Write a structure and sequence with these properties.
The complex is a heteroheptamer. Chain D is mainly β. Chain D is built from one helix and five strands, in the order E-H-E-E-E-E. The chains are: A mainly beta (215), B mainly beta (357), C mainly beta (221), D mainly beta (83), E mainly beta (761), F mainly alpha (218), G little secondary structure (56). At the A-C interface, strand 5, strand 9, strand 12, strand 13 and strand 15 of A face strand 11, strand 12 and strand 16 of C. Chain F: This is Outer membrane protein assembly factor BamD.
Chain lengths: 215, 357, 221, 83, 761, 218, 56
């Protein structure tokens, strides 16, 4: 193969400023690249052929720049939802085709505080013998947030699993569900179950807990 | 081909009076034309329409003129050179005949004939009678060039410019001409007195034709002599042309006659004295053969000629032994010198006169 | 335009022939490839055929064990997959090429997820997520349904047969230690709507043939 | 595509100068020769005006005569066209 | 003295009986008194007895007589412009030849006859002499010493009666020259007896067409020097006065064709007299009367002058001959090639009425084919016939095939031997074929092709072709990859018009491709198809086999083939893919040239030549690159190498590559050669040229790969120019050429002396 | 170029003949000519020379030689040889095998040579009915007859293939007046049968019917 | 220069029969031209290669 370098990572910016996404090639070959955009849950599409030529039906903003060693993709006065993960592809080495890592495009909105909710196990799960207590962050920005479960002062780990939705196309907020899975037995083993959420959007760590159901 | 030179002479001084570069010359080209004196004066030209008028003792120009269209087509005049009564009377290639005055290069008259003027007007008791390279004989005035009558004659298909110096006696005029024919005729209507053949027709229609053309004859006293090239040297009666003797001989150039003897050359360029009435050779000199030589004259009791090499071939008159020798010109010659009444001269092919001691 | 075969479930070591169909364009040129992408964000080119089935090139992972063929009359691509391993599981795309320039694609398939696994299919279990009298009574609260112990992917979940679409958050599936997935699908609605609006999530798991329509009501305590 | 003529020319008014009772030599001076002539007896002569121009197109006139032993006429036959 | 018998002694070359007959005498009695006179006059009238000496013993007459020695060898020394055959003719005119005895005294007359001949040349200074060599067996040899001297120039041509209008410079139109430019040099001034005769009447003809009817000659006179060096010529004439014409009329038999001649005779009144216009008018009429089937009328044009106004009424009279026909046709030339083969181009036909023009159309059709060295028609009249006429068409045949030899000079077939042969009059048939067999000890390529232009009547042409081919040079991984291929062509062809032709046909090919280089620009087509093999890889291989259609258009209108002089010949071909095939595309090629002389008299001629080549496809289907054009090779481009033109190769460095755009031409000056005689000078052709040519592709770009330049433009022109000799020889056509290029564009090459073989175009 | 009496030269001439050697004997004989143009066996030399020209096929020299000799020697008994040789000359002049292999038709070429041969052999018969040269000359004459026939037949064929329906038959009336033989002639009645129908002549088509039935169809 | 040839001649190359055709009852052949006639005679001497050319 060949080192197909894609830099930097996943980025975010506001509407109207320009962006330069770098893709670096190990063997310094000019015009041996194609750019493809993958929308979430959508088929990937072609952006640039010849490593500098734009495909039909698309605004002029997109530009291909840089040398064989290093190329960059330039978006000038970037507009609305164009957010997708973008990859490069080399065709210099025909037998092995190499792609970029993929740049996952996020956006920059104002800070948004999550609305914390706590969910006790359902009355259909109490006949199962296992209890699932769920912590919910609903609409926040940025994604970076420290959420810890506290039961009798214990940082539960390896038993809790989180799931974060993708950035909304409407309010651009994130949602996380941190599920703490215990047995029905262990639910009554401890008295207070708490979820503390620390986020940039919050003025103070919001802890929400329950002791005996959530009537 | 051509014999080499014998030793130079050292046996009379090689004497030269002045010379002059005169006219544009005529060049390699054969013609028959050479200048003519009068009292204290000479005149000349080139085959170029361009004409002079000079002196006899200084050679400066009393005047000089020229003629051509105003376009400016050169005339190429090679008629004769003759004067009379202060006027000169010359012909061209063009059957156009030019009578100017001597005192100035201005016309006496101008008139027309047939055929080329390779030839020499001749006059005797007035009333000039003229001939050309056409076998055509015009008969002419003196002051308008008017014709009085004209004769036609036979010509061959080919020649070496068979022409002849027309000649007169007792008002009866005679000349040779081509076709080996000779004619003795009037001067008034020019009609026939008689004719004569002398050549022999033996070849094959190519060299029965070197006797066609007739080289200059001349009269002496009730008798005439003549020849042609590879022809017969004759001695013939003035009244009748009947023969006095003959010598199987050829040549092309004119002969000198003084005394009871006749003085002339060979077609092979060797010279001799033959008898008046015998054709019996007193002597010859035979050294300078195939040399391209020129006709002589007499000057103060001796002879010299010139050549195509442009030299002087002085001799003893009595045996022809070379008495003197001069290189005089690099251009050779084509035509004849003259002298008169104390003064000797020659013209070059290349437009150069020499006045002579 | 491009209709493909299924992905299902298989055992490591078994074989499978997948099909992909071409519809409008000529299809009698167009080098075609199979390229798989793992949810771990790994892109891999696995196979290529060009202009016809004359030149076939494979990636350095299969090393020829798999076979790609096409039928022009049926405008169909055939992929027969020999010995199978767990790593081969990925989203597989039937990809087309670009005319007159080549060496890059124009058309991409739907993507086909292949799953090799010793485990058996299991239909999902739905449990209501309803706290009833939250710190929001006039604001907006959120409720959901919990899908647990389901294998394999995917499950289609909608609310009120597509009538309820606003405020819905379907969290990404997590793989449990049991080897089964479990996720919760929630929706945020105004508090006044609760008890007046029926919130029903309809869940369908095709491999297990499980269609559950579960209703969430303002149950207290 | 090509064109052809064949036969003996005609003025077609020459024909209006033709009367029976004329020696063959008179017609020789009139016309010049014929070219077809019975090599089976029957002193006779032929005269024809065929042409075949065009990819399609055919034509022919003819007059055809028989004479005595005397080289003098007996009868004619003008077929002014063809069949 | 009395004699009873006669004996002869010293005659070794003649009978004694004839000897004793030549002297009539009464033997056995006292013979007459003429025996001495008879021996003398007879034995020396023969020219065969040198001396006689007769005496009488008393009973027998002994004759002691020699024989004149006879010439063995007649030899010549001093020949410079003179050929001994003509000299022997002059000897036979003398009455003398090898094997003849003689007087040794007419030698002078012999010399004289020789010198008369020298005169007849134009030399009069010469001198000839005999050299006798006595030899045994009553023999002699004779040698001739010449001293040719020199000829003359000409000095003046001055004329009597040329007044009121000079021509003393316009005389320069003659054969003869009284002025030799030192900057226009190849001859000199020399007299001739007959060029004289021509230019006299020529000048007369000039003045006869400037408005004269009395421009007469009085006489013509010539002379020269005693040294026989330069000539003086003069001529005596009348220029009279001008003249004009006033109306024209005719008289004589027709067939009511008055209205056509009416068109040919048409003029305006009051126009300047000519005499040549008259003649061509007559002759045009003669053509018309050919068409109507007349040969031998008479035509006369009589001026009825009025010099009172300098006008004429040209009375004319015609006698339309009695009609003709044809009887018979005959052909000569057929030693190998059958008859009826040529008749099928005779647009004249037998057995009917007639044109004198059909005759010429057949002459043309013949001279087209180049199957003959030379041609001759003729036309007699049959005996005892007023109207029946016959004809002959004669020719001189020619061997016309070839043996082509391509060696990949300049490497378009590399190190190779392309052998092959063509013949268009195959076995004397109209059958036509061509073949090649090609060998390198690892590659094969052989091909056959055939056509009968007259498979069926009316010029139905039908041809086939096949080729099998393997190319193998990747035995060391070298460029110019391995291909194997083989295929066929079929074709019909026919004309519709009597000059313009069409043809069309099909073909099928089969192709097998292997060990393709990694060259880079090539793979574009293959992307167009679809595939992407190399990084730089070498296992590439491919196959494809295709049917196809083609068609051709042809305009051929010349004096002839085989070193023509006039007209033009052009052929275009368009070839095309068909539905179903592995691909789709179409191309066109055109090849053009045209000959125009000045007058075909001294043969100062010019050609113009051009060709175009293009093609492109559809449906994303372009044509192949192996079907590219190519250029250079000193057949199309003189002073350049085979397929060495145009862009450079490309890897991921330089060798011409072929393309799809062409435009190339060459502009010439045609020449004869005076240094060789007609005998073969007729069969050779020389010229100069100035050659241009260029090539490119439109699909090619450099907006994207701009590290090496573009090769997409009609600019960047290749230019050279040179000279070429083309000469026939029994192995086929041959041509060499040497040129000099003076406009390259980087990365290209050539040679100066070059060679080509077979069918030259 | 030795110099000798012509006897030794003629001796080695005979030898070279016996040697089968031409190119030497050729020049030997030319020198014998030039050295002795009135030798006592000059005539024999001419025979040997013409024999040479045949066996070496230097043809036009031989033609000129033959007509010169017979012109100049009009009379001697072996003259018949000459005439035969003359026709043989012309017989060769027509013929060739630079092209000949088995399955050529030699027809359809310049035949005048054959006509000359015909006249020659014919004259020769008419002068020398009783020589020893004739039994083959006849067969060769027959050859020329059939050949002339095929030639003309072929011309008829072409015209027929054109449809020169008439000029052909005018050829053929002479073909009859000359050629009553040669199946080709018999092969030509049907051509008239085509002709007269192109003529719309019925009344002679019956003549064609008669003659054909008159011939024995084979 | 001057080299080429054939090989084979002095060959008898004939086989041909005689031919000639009568005429019918009623009508006629055309009268033959006495131009190609046959002074025929019975032959009985040398022929073919069994034949002499060695001149006299």
């Amino acid at each position: 193969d060949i080192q197909m370098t894609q830099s930097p990572a996943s980025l975010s910016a506001s509407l109207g400023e320009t962006v330069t996404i770098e893709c670096r090639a190990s063997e310094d070959i000019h015009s041996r690249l194609a750019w493809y955009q993958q929308k979430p849950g959508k088929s990937p599409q072609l952006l640039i052929y010849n490593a500098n030529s734009l495909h039909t039906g698309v605004p002029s903003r997109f530009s291909g720049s840089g040398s064989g060693t290093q190329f960059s993709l330039k978006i000038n006065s970037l507009q609305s939802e164009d957010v997708a993960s973008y990859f490069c592809l080399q065709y210099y080495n025909y037998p092995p085709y190499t792609f970029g890592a993929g740049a996952k495009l996020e956006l920059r909105r104002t800070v948004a505080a999550p609305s914390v909710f706590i969910f006790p196990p359902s009355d259909e799960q109490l006949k199962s013998g296992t209890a699932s207590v769920v912590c919910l962050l609903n609409n926040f920005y940025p994604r970076e947030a420290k959420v810890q479960w506290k039961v009798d002062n214990a940082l539960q780990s390896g038993n809790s699993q989180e799931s974060v939705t993708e950035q909304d196309s409407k309010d651009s907020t994130y949602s996380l569900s941190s599920t703490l899975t215990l047995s029905k037995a262990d639910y009554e083993k401890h008295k207070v179950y708490a979820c503390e959420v620390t986020h940039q959007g919050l003025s103070s760590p919001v802890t929400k807990s329950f002791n005996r159901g959530e009537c | 081909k051509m014999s080499p030179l014998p030793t130079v002479e050292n046996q009379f001084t090689p004497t030269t009076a002045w010379s002059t570069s005169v006219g544009s010359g005529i060049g390699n080209f054969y013609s028959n034309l050479h200048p003519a004196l009068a009292d204290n004066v000479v005149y000349a030209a080139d085959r170029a329409g361009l004409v002079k008028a000079l002196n006899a003792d200084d050679g400066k120009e009393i005047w000089s003129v020229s003629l051509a269209e105003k376009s400016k087509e050169p005339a190429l005049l090679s008629g004769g050179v003759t004067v009379s009564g202060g006027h000169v009377y010359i012909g061209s290639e063009k059957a156009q005949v030019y009578a100017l005055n001597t005192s100035d290069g201005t016309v006496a008259w101008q008139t027309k004939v047939a055929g080329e003027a390779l030839s020499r007007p001749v006059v005797s008791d007035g009333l000039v009678l003229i001939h050309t390279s056409n076998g055509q004989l015009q008969a002419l005035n003196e002051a308008d060039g008017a014709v009085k009558w004209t004769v036609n004659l036979d010509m061959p298909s080919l020649s070496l410019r068979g022409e002849s110096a027309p000649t007169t006696a007792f008002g009866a005029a005679v000349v040779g001409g081509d076709n080996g024919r000779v004619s003795a005729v009037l001067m008034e209507q020019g009609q026939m007195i008689w004719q004569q053949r002398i050549s022999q027709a033996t070849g094959s229609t190519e060299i029965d034709r070197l006797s066609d053309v007739d080289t200059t004859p001349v009269v002496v006293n009730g008798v005439v002599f003549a020849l042609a090239y590879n022809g017969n040297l004759t001695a013939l009666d003035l009244r009748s042309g009947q023969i006095m003797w003959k010598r199987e001989l050829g040549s092309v150039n004119d002969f000198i006659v003084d005394g009871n003897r006749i003085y002339l050359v060979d077609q092979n360029d060797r010279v001799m004295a033959l008898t008046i009435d015998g054709g019996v050779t007193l002597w010859t000199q035979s050294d300078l053969l195939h040399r391209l030589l020129t006709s002589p004259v007499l000057y103060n009791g001796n002879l010299v000629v010139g050549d195509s090499e442009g030299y002087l071939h002085w001799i003893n008159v009595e045996d022809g032994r070379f008495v003197a020798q001069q290189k005089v010109d690099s251009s050779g010659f084509q035509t004849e010198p003259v002298a008169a009444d104390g003064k000797l001269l020659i013209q070059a092919k290349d437009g150069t006169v020499y006045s002579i001691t | 335009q491009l209709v493909e075969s299924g992905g299902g479930l298989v055992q490591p070591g078994r074989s499978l022939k997948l099909s992909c169909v071409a519809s409008r364009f000529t299809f009698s040129n167009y080098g075609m490839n199979w390229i798989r992408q793992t949810p771990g964000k790994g892109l891999e080119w696995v196979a290529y055929i060009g202009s016809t089935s004359s030149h076939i090139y494979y990636a350095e992972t299969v090393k020829g064990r798999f076979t790609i063929s096409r039928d022009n009359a049926k405008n169909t691509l055939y992929l027969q997959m020999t010995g199978l391993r767990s790593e081969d599981t990925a989203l597989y795309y039937c990809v087309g090429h670009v005319r007159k320039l080549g060496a890059f694609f124009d058309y991409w398939g739907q993507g086909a997820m292949v799953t090799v696994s010793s485990a058996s299919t299991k239909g999902p279990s739905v449990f209501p997520l309803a706290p009833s009298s939250k710190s929001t009574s006039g604001g907006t609260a959120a409720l959901g349904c919990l899908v647990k112990d389901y294998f394999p992917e995917p499950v289609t979940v909608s609310w009120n047969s597509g009538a309820l679409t606003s405020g819905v958050h379907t969290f990404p599936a997590v793989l449990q230690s049991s080897g089964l997935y479990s996720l919760s699908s929630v929706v945020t609605v105004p508090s006044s709507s609760l008890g007046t609006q029926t919130y029903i999530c309809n869940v369908n798991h095709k491999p297990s043939n499980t269609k559950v329509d579960k209703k969430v009501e303002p149950k207290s305590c | 595509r090509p064109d052809i003529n064949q036969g003996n020319y005609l003025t077609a008014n020459d024909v209006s100068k033709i009367r029976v009772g004329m020696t063959q030599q008179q017609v020789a001076y009139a016309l010049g020769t014929p070219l077809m002539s019975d090599p089976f007896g029957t002193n006779t002569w032929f005269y024809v005006f065929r042409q075949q121009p065009g990819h399609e197109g055919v034509t022919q006139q003819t007059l055809t005569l028989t004479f005595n032993s005397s080289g003098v006429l007996t009868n004619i036959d003008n077929k002014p066209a063809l069949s | 003295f009395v004699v009873k018998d006669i004996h002869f002694e010293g005659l070794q070359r003649v009978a004694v009986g004839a000897a004793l007959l030549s002297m009539p005498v009464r033997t056995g009695d006292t013979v007459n008194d003429e025996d001495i006179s008879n021996t003398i006059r007879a034995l020396f009238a023969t020219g065969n007895f040198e001396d006689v000496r007769v005496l009488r013993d008393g009973d027998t007459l002994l004759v002691q007589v020699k024989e004149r020695p006879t010439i063995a060898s007649i030899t010549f020394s001093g020949n410079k412009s003179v050929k001994d055959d003509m000299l022997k003719q002059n000897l036979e005119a003398s009455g003398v030849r090898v094997g003849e005895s003689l007087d040794r005294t007419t030698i002078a007359d012999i010399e004289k006859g020789l010198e008369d001949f020298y005169y007849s040349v134009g030399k009069y200074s010469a001198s000839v002499k005999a050299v006798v060599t006595p030899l045994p067996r009553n023999r002699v040899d004779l040698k001739l010493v010449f001293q040719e001297g020199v000829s003359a120039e000409i000095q003046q041509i001055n004329i009597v009666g040329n007044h009121a209008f000079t021509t003393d410079e316009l005389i320069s139109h003659f054969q003869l020259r009284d002025e030799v430019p030192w900057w226009n040099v190849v001859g000199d001034r020399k007299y001739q007896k007959q060029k004289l005769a021509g230019d006299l009447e020529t000048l007369r003809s000039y003045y006869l067409d400037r408005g004269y009817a009395r421009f007469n000659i009085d006489s013509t006179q010539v002379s020269l020097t005693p040294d026989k060096k330069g000539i003086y010529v003069t001529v005596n004439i009348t220029e009279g006065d001008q003249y004009k014409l006033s109306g024209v009329e005719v008289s004589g038999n027709l067939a009511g064709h008055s209205a056509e001649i009416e068109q040919l005779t048409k003029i305006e009144p009051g126009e300047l007299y000519n005499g040549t216009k008259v003649t061509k008018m007559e002759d045009d009429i003669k053509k018309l009367l050919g068409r109507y089937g007349y040969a031998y009328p008479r035509v006369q044009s009589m001026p009825e002058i009025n010099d009172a106004d300098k006008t004429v009424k040209l009375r004319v009279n015609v006698d339309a001959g009695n009609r003709f026909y044809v009887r018979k046709i005959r052909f000569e030339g057929n030693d190998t090639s059958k008859d009826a083969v040529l008749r099928r181009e005779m647009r004249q036909m037998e057995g009917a009425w007639l044109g004198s023009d059909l005759v010429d159309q057949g002459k043309e059709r013949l001279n087209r084919l180049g199957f003959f060295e030379t041609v001759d028609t003729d036309t007699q009249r049959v005996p005892g016939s007023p109207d029946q006429v016959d004809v002959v068409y004669k020719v001189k045949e020619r061997n016309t095939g070839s043996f082509n030899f391509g060696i990949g000079y300049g490497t378009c077939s590399g190190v190779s031997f392309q052998a092959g042969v063509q013949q268009d009059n195959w076995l004397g048939t109209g059958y036509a074929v061509g073949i090649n067999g090609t060998k390198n000890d690892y590659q094969t390529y052989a091909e056959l092709s055939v056509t009968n232009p007259y498979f069926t009547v009316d010029g139905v042409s039908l041809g086939g072709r096949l080729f099998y081919n393997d190319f193998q040079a990747d035995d060391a991984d070298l460029s110019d990859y391995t291909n194997k291929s083989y295929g066929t062509d079929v074709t019909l062809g026919f004309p519709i018009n009597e000059y313009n032709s069409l043809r069309a046909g099909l073909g099928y090919v089969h192709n097998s491709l292997s060990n393709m280089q990694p060259q880079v620009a090539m793979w574009r087509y293959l992307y167009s198809m679809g595939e992407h093999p190399s990084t730089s890889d070498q296992d590439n291989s491919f196959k494809t086999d295709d049917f196809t259609f083609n068609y051709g258009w042809t305009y051929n209108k010349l004096d002839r083939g085989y070193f023509p002089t006039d007209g033009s010949r052009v052929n275009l071909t368009g070839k095309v893919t068909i539905p179903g095939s592995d691909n789709e595309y179409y191309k066109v090629t055109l090849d053009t040239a045209t000959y125009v002389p000045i007058d075909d008299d001294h043969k100062w001629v010019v050609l113009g030549r051009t060709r175009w080549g293009y093609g492109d496809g559809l449906g994303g289907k372009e044509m192949p690159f192996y079907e590219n054009f190519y250029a250079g090779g000193s057949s199309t481009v003189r002073g350049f190498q085979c397929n060495t033109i145009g862009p450079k190769a490309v890897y991921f460095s330089d060798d011409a590559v072929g393309g799809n755009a062409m435009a190339v031409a060459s502009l010439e000056f045609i020449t004869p050669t005076p240094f060789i005689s007609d005998k073969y000078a007729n069969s050779v052709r020389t010229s100069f040229f100035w050659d241009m040519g260029t090539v490119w592709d439109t699909n090619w770009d450099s907006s994207q790969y701009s590290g090496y330049p573009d090769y997409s433009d009609p600019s960047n022109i290749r230019m050279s120019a040179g000279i070429a000799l083309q000469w026939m020889s029994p192995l086929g056509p041959l041509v060499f050429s040497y040129a000099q290029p003076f406009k390259k564009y980087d990365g290209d090459k050539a040679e100066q002396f070059q060679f080509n073989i077979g069918k030259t175009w | 170029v030795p110099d000798n009496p012509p006897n030794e030269i003629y001796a080695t001439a005979q030898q070279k003949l016996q040697d089968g050697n031409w190119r030497q004997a050729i020049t030997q004989l030319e020198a014998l000519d030039n050295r002795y143009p009135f030798g006592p066996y000059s005539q024999q030399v001419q025979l040997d020379l013409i024999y040479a020209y045949y066996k070496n096929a230097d043809l036009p020299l031989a033609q000129a030689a033959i007509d010169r000799f017979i012109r100049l020697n009009p009379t001697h008994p072996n003259i018949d040889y000459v005439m035969y040789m003359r026709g043989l000359t012309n017989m060769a002049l027509d013929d060739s095998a630079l092209q000949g292999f088995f399955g050529v038709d030699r027809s359809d070429r310049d035949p005048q040579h054959a006509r000359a041969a015909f006249s020659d052999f014919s004259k020769l018969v008419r002068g020398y009915p009783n020589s020893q040269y004739t039994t083959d000359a006849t067969k060769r004459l027959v050859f020329l007859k059939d050949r002339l026939a095929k030639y003309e037949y072929s011309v008829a064929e072409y015209y027929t293939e054109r449809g020169a329906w008439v000029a052909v038959v005018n050829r053929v009336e002479g073909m009859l007046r000359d050629y009553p033989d040669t199946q080709a002639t018999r092969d030509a009645l049907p051509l008239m049968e085509n002709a007269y129908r192109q003529m719309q002549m019925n009344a002679q088509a019956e003549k064609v019917a008669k003659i054909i039935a008159a011939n024995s169809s084979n | 220069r001057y080299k080429r040839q054939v090989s084979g001649d002095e060959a008898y190359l004939e086989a041909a029969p005689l031919a000639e055709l009568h005429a019918p009852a009623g009508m006629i052949l055309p009268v033959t031209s006495g131009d190609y006639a046959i002074p025929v005679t019975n032959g009985s001497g040398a022929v073919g290669k069994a034949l002499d050319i060695r001149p006299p």
